[PDB]
């Protein structure tokens, strides 16, 4: 089964998921000098005041904070998007060391980690139908650098002890994702894919320019999680990132001058 080891990591995925070598795969390097300001882009609209988190799950590749998406509560609109996209989960990708861990890079710079807030287009009715469409998903990507602590992240960090191994979950209500956003919503955007199998080409990527700062102690607790299940040999959950993929026939657009 796929993962991030030497025998099953990203260079192997194309054997079970041939779309891995496709025309709109993610992540990519963001070359800041080639991304063109697009004055037709609108400001992002992030409406998370009514978000309802339910649960946190270690799925063996990352941990997902899951939301109730049965009504239009926490939604992403505007920016490059047409229509309304509903928040379903967020998760992170991170490194074994502070010098790597993000999936997108900026002028080849790797950040310590990257947050993905995953939303689906309500015109397709459910997430499973949305991922079959080229405009089915919108993922908001936020870089993490190591410095000062992020207070709004600490409630996530403190529950990770209870979901150390694959398949463990814990109740996780009343978490406010507004506490994970940077001050500025300036962004880059391009058409891409899921960055894990099945690597479907269904995502409008919206990557914020401003990273958030987290503390060394916070990211250290990410790195104590396990890829393995309970009672299996311990394999630390680190370096769960896909490297940058070819840009091919795509343009990255900037919302800012
Ligand atoms: C309970 O919550 C669910 C329920 C059903 C599906 C999912 N998500 C999923 O299947 N895949 C996914 C999402 C984003 C990315 S990524 N790294 O490109 O942002 C990669 C893969 C979550
Ligand atoms: Zn992701």
Give the tokens for residue 249.
């026939």
How many structural domains compose the chain?
1
Q: Beta 253-254 vs 187-192: how paired, if at all?
A: antiparallel
Annotated resolution, angstroms: 1.6
Nearest CA to ligand 1 atom 8: 89
Q: Probe ligand 1: pick from 196, 201, 203, max atoms within 8 Å of CB? A: 196
Q: Beta 36-37 vs 44-47: how paired, if at all?
A: unpaired
Judged by phi (left if over 0) then psi (alpha if -120 to 50, else beta), residue 191 lies in beta
> Is 127 touching ligand 1 by the criterion CB < 6 Å?
yes
Looking from the CA of residue 103, the nearest atom of ligand 1 is 17
Nearest CA to ligand 1 atom 17: 195
Helix (H, G, I), strand (E, B) or coil at 183: coil
> Is 56 touching ligand 1 by the criterion CB < 6 Å?
no
Maximum alpha-carbon separation in the chain: 55
- Which residues are part of the catalytic machinery? 61
User: Closest Cα to residue 35, out of 191, 214, 190?
Assistant: 190
Do 34 and 250 contact (CB within 8 A), yes or no?
no
Helix (H, G, I), strand (E, B) or coil at 170: strand
Run of H or E residues at 218? helix 216-222
Experiment used for this model:
X-ray
Give the tokens for residue 19.
């779309």
Q: DSSP class of residue 198? A: T
For residue 178, what is the domain's CATH number?
A: 3.10.200.10
Task: Give residue 87's domain range.
Answer: 1-257
């Amino acid at each position: 089964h796929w993962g991030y080891g030497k025998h099953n990591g990203p260079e192997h995925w194309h054997k079970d998921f041939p779309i891995a070598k496709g025309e709109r795969q993610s992540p990519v390097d963001i070359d800041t000098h080639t991304a063109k300001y697009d004055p037709s882009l609108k400001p992002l609209s992030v409406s998370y005041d009514q978000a309802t988190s339910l649960r946190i799950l270690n799925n063996g590749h990352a941990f997902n904070v899951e939301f109730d998406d049965s009504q239009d509560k926490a939604v992403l609109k505007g920016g490059p998007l047409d229509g309304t996209y509903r928040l379903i989960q967020f998760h992170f990708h991170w490194g074994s060391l502070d010098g790597q861990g993000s999936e997108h890079t900026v002028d080849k710079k790797k950040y310590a980690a990257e947050l993905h807030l995953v939303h689906w287009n309500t015109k397709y009715g459910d997430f499973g139908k949305a991922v079959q469409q080229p405009d089915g998903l919108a993922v908001l990507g936020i870089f993490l650098k190591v410095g000062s602590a992020k207070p709004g992240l600490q409630k996530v960090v403190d529950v990770l002890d209870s979901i150390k191994t694959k398949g463990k979950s814990a109740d996780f209500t009343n978490f406010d994702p507004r506490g994970l956003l940077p001050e500025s919503l300036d962004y880059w955007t391009y058409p891409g894919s899921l960055t894990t199998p099945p690597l479907l080409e269904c995502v409008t990527w919206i990557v914020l320019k401003e990273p958030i700062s987290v503390s060394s102690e916070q990211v250290l607790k990410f790195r104590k999680l396990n890829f393995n299940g309970e009672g299996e040999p311990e394999e630390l959950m680190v370096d769960n990132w896909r490297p940058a993929q070819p840009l091919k026939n795509r343009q990255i657009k900037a919302s800012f001058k």
